[model samples]
Target chain A: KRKVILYARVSSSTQKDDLVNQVKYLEEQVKEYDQVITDIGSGLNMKRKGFLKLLRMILNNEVSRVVVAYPDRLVRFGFEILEEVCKAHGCEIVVINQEDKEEELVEDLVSILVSFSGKLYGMRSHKYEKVKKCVEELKN
Target chain B: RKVILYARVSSSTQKDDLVNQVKYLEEQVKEYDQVITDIGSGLNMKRKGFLKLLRMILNNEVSRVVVAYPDRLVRFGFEILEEVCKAHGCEIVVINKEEELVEDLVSILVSFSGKLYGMRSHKYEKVKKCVEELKN
Candidate 1:
């Protein structure tokens, strides 16, 4: 059966506030949909179960439209690339709040830097702070 | 209807690797009208050959595109490129299997992780050296 899907996601399980906010905001737009898919994981995480599920749905032509809070909520990097994929599959991704592209690009790069530092040094490590500070300095 | 074999190497020093990539892709494609190659990081979107291939696809000049592996096309967003080809009525032949694709992605991730600072400007080398010392 063809379906319209509402999707929500957060960067981490710890960010439950964002998860609920995203759901609440999107729910206001469309009170009704075939199903809702949500995930709590980094957009860069390819193994995310819900994200993979949506990919399968698109490939199978089971989806008509996918509604999301923002492009980054769907994935961290390469939203346009994914958009092209969705368009090719005869599916469309509808973002509720289209925000600033250039500023968001900077934030996205900052997030990538933080993720790298966190991976190399322990999340709470002092060296992580140094890297974070260095990035902040660079951003200014 | 035209079939194009595409290959890429991350750096100019990998000329030998690029040759092997082209040879392998040629074998997979069997017979193609032309072979396009790029010597640049897969993360770099400005690669001349890559943009040329995209232009060709957009103009509906290509019927098929073949690569030795998914990573041979791009480090990330291979799916985007694949779908772009499909949408343009072109078929993409990835000669590698899923297991090989997974390994290639992992290798790319590790490679990019190590070179994260390199992706930024030269002044960031201070931070890069800082990271190197921390890792050491």
Candidate 2:
């Protein structure tokens, strides 16, 4: 039997955790030859453990199809990487809930920028405290 | 311009001067005028007048804002709030008298991602350490 990998990701681990829903679906979809890789972090960067594992499996000729909630849960952008990888190897990728996760995806981008910006100024002058307070207010 | 002019003076100053300063500032820019006069250290956020300013900013009551001193606005992100005012067209003030570039602000997440993500979920260990070395 060929292998089908269920890959799901949520940029946040808090309220509306992305993986929680995917896990339920993947579990119901699971069978003898099916497997699942879940990630609970931003797709901004691909240090995701599940993604790495899926990549390795693809190169090893162990997968025939991949299922995910969105193209982004796989990676924030650059869908071609996975598309070409799958196509080159005769594997297929399925996006079950392709409902434009762009909102949360955009949030991740803004989050990283805020994080990076907050981190930057947090280390500097009194103005850092100034900026932090303003950004902090927005948080609440 | 419903700017509630926020002016602060030391406690030693006469109460009349506060009214004078408010009126004076109001002279240049005051139509729908209300003034919050803080009579304590800038660090003391609990000052009655300061809280009024804070509340007005939050409650969305005032259509405009003014503070004689930037520190009077006290320890808030000028950029973050500034961005919001522009986005929502909610007319807020800007920064002067003291300014800093925000080029390095994004690094804030690197320092606290661990403690932050830990509360939210597990497996952010690496994300916690995403930055090269923030603590330094």
Candidate 3:
């Protein structure tokens, strides 16, 4: 059994074959699996099934090394966060190529920003401002 | 074999002062493969030298990136890049790496989304054109 896991991802589900090609490149770097752990979800998509499974596998020590096309594809906010997790769990991350670095970086940057905008805008939507004010007054 | 000493300032009015600032930082991190300087607002997200530095950093050309000040790199998420450096076994040197949170982050994200959309608004038309052509 091969311990190398090729992890490829796309920010969107309807996007083209870039993810496929990214995985293809990483596939050449390591043994190809019957099914790759591809996640269509992105940075803010913390609940993508495959990615969660990938994390589960890492936590359970099912993989030895994780190969990917780019760093952003691996995860958005935490370049080192996941790496630290893997280090703690005794696995490795291998960046296979820098092929679409610029595109991926820009997309990741913009997408994360948009997600934050939603969060900032959404925080006041649940009508918690008054509750928050009350808590602040109680503390003081 | 890779080290980057980056320096920056807001505008030409601050040129000599910033250049001297670079010089001072150079002395502090005397051992480096290259030196980069930028003349613009770091919060703006687009600068000639800063972009070039990013390309170098992402492409694995630079190992240890040194900046005189934290905000000199990127105003909002310098911590992300700093963490990235650790992931890649690269190092980041900043004069001030203070941390603050939550509300300020929301504002930064707000402006970042604005700037990103402004920069790429043309893509919307491009995709629109493709969609229209598909029907034809």
Candidate 4:
């Protein structure tokens, strides 16, 4: 039997209600899956107690699948980190909302575009800096 | 009829791709007096655009709010949803869930159950900790 783990995150204690609902939904959804783990914490902060526990379970091969209510609930450093961790643990992530599917695809595309634009921005800035340096040398 | 369009992406990696949806919405709603776009995480309540939009709604400057989906606007919890709708006296239209009665019912039921369990656990933990501290 595949063991499913539910990871629910809330940015603050005030949103604890949200996390609870998420866990309940997951419980119903994964009735057959063994050992469900629920975590709640800020998406901005990675050092969450529940998240750490979930990671350990995954690394130990205790979790076969990870379920989340939405992609943003699982958002942290970036997609690279998420992809790496899930791949390392051989765990499949399932998001409840289908819109998150498009959101993930769009995120990848935007990352590429942002990378290209960042390179161009850096090059342009470097050229400007070089011209400034040359003018300073000539003055000296 | 000045209206601001709020667009949010969870990460910097989605900054560009989210533009397409914002652009599409803007084009479709062109007849609106004004349209504005913003990108931020749905989890963040302090998002600049979200705050600005709140101000607009409070001031009655915005007649309607158009979004790709309900989760896009605010995905955190029902409390936030209730607060925003109550404060603004606005109605949310979820484009999806047209025939999905199960989805709505499940959402409500789960929300209620979660509340009950969370409170129970919290109380139990508080009592357990108090007893442990007394022993110390």
Candidate 5:
């Protein structure tokens, strides 16, 4: 019997209705697993209570898979955060809405491009700004 | 000879300021093969540009790194600062003061405190409070 855990997050109070629907959807899906756990917390909060609780469960070998409604719904930090979480916990993250066969190619391409662009332009732009600030400070 | 110039800024408002500095540094060191700039808060270890700079240093892709000041690059502490410099094996030129005197002093104090407390030292908390007060 497989043990599964569901993690849900809403960034703002205005999205409370969406949060309810997410929980309802997860509850319906819970019947597939022998044991299921659910956690709710704010997305903006880095000290995500529910996520941390889920991590503790993962560390203890209590959960084999983690399910979320969407990728962004699980974390806003994107691929890096997802990679770190999966690596640390040794558990599979399943996005219920994404059909693996259809979205895999697009997802992989987007992730690679974004990561490359982020390293290149991101770092260069940052360096340019720093040099300018020093010049201004010196002038003052 | 591939050269990279590194620059950084703490906030969004300082974009123009860093651009001006990059322009000036380019003029000052035109002999370099390439230049790259990285902008970020000195306290933030997760700065993407700075991390990239470190990677270049480790890979021997960069020959030199020029900075406006030591504190501008990192104000974390001596141990971390030394590790960064040692890892790259590249000389760091500070445009401001002669050297990082305050960092050296704090390093000594932290070492002594750690030795005195052994395992129970709340050194991190102490450092955090001091840094917070300094920032204020």
Candidate 6:
């Protein structure tokens, strides 16, 4: 009965719509919470200000639960490890999208590949189109 | 003494960064026998060039492996890789020192305790305004 902390994240500021939708969806999923924390940064960014804030609150046993739309929204590669860390502090990580772990892994993998491809080729470049093709191939 | 040089850039568009790394390592390792460069995230494990380097090291084919930074080889588990290299009689030479993680938790506590945590306070209306300002 302490507090529930709603959390949301989007990879880029360009995805402002996605960010809004993420927060809106979280608001629906967690109707009552102490506060909502949203972050706009790469999933792989270790120094995301909002994420760091959430981690500190968890470590200090300040939050009862931390809710997110997805595990990748927390961190790209090491969600389980972070989950264990949060559990140790009595802070539960509530993922609203209760999909299979494998699907989440694949989703994050594709996102990582696309993120790197966007870096390898300009987001609008012909080469990026080819990378997108390869990503599609990998998906199936 | 077969020495192999390794370099990496997280993405291909960082071609200039790759060049700078190779150039800098080349000068430092003037007489290295081979050069390996890969384009992928350090968190990504399937880098072709990195796998090749690992193969050569495990095969005891190289005496020394030179890299610009430990993170340039792999992030988060450099020590295990270094141990594997040492087990196979390969020495890793990192040109730069590794600098400091839990501190991220500490700093946010210090800075955001007033704004980020005082959410239930009437005076904390500014917190909502600040989070909203991020969107607009």
Best by TM-score: 1
Q: Which candidate has the highest lDDT of all?
A: 1
Compose the digit string of candidate 3's lDDT tens values, residues A54-77.
766765657777877777676654
Candidate RMSDs in order = 8.9, 17.7, 12.9, 21.3, 19.2, 17.2
Query: Residue pairs in steric clash, candidate 4?
Result: none
- Candidates' C-alpha lDDT: 0.67, 0.55, 0.60, 0.51, 0.50, 0.64
- With candidate 1 superimposed using the best TM-score fit, by how many Å does residue B26's alpha carbon deviate from the native? 2.8
Question: Can you give the TM-score per candidate against the true fold?
Answer: 0.57, 0.40, 0.44, 0.35, 0.35, 0.42
- DockQ, every prediction: 0.12, 0.02, 0.02, 0.01, 0.02, 0.03
Better of 1 and 2 by TM-score: 1
* Least accurate 10 contiguous residues by lDDT in model 2 chain A: A131-140
Cα lDDT tens digits for candidate 5, A1-140: 34677777665566679777877887686655444443444332345567656655654556678887766555433233334335444578877775212222223222322333344344553223322322232222
| Candidate 1, B1-136: lDDT as tens digits | 7899888876688789889988887776667898899987666566788777776776678999888776676655665565566657889888882222323333433443444434454434444543454444
| Alpha-carbon interface RMSD for all candidates, in angstroms | 9.6, 18.7, 15.2, 26.0, 20.6, 17.2
- Evaluate model 4 with DockQ and give the value: 0.01
The residue ranges of model 1 lying beyond 4 angstroms of the native Cα positions read: A100-140, B1-4, B9-20, B27-41, B44-70, B77-136
TM-score of 5: 0.35
> What tens digits encode model 6's per-residue C-alpha lDDT throughout A1-140?
46688888876678789789988898887768898898887666667788877776665568889998877688755465455455555678889885323333444445554664665464343334444543564465
- Evaluated at residue B43, the lDDT of candidate 6 is 53
Docking class of 5: incorrect
Report the candidate with higher DockQ, 2 versus 6.
Answer: 6
The residue-level lDDT of candidate 5 at A43 comes to: 37
- Name the 10 consecutive residues with the lowest summed lDDT in model 1 chain B: B97-106
Expressed as tens digits, the lDDT of each residue in B18-95 for candidate 6 is: 999999999998899999999876655667887777767755688998998766776544544554564567788989
Candidate 4 local Cα displacement, residue B15, angstroms? 26
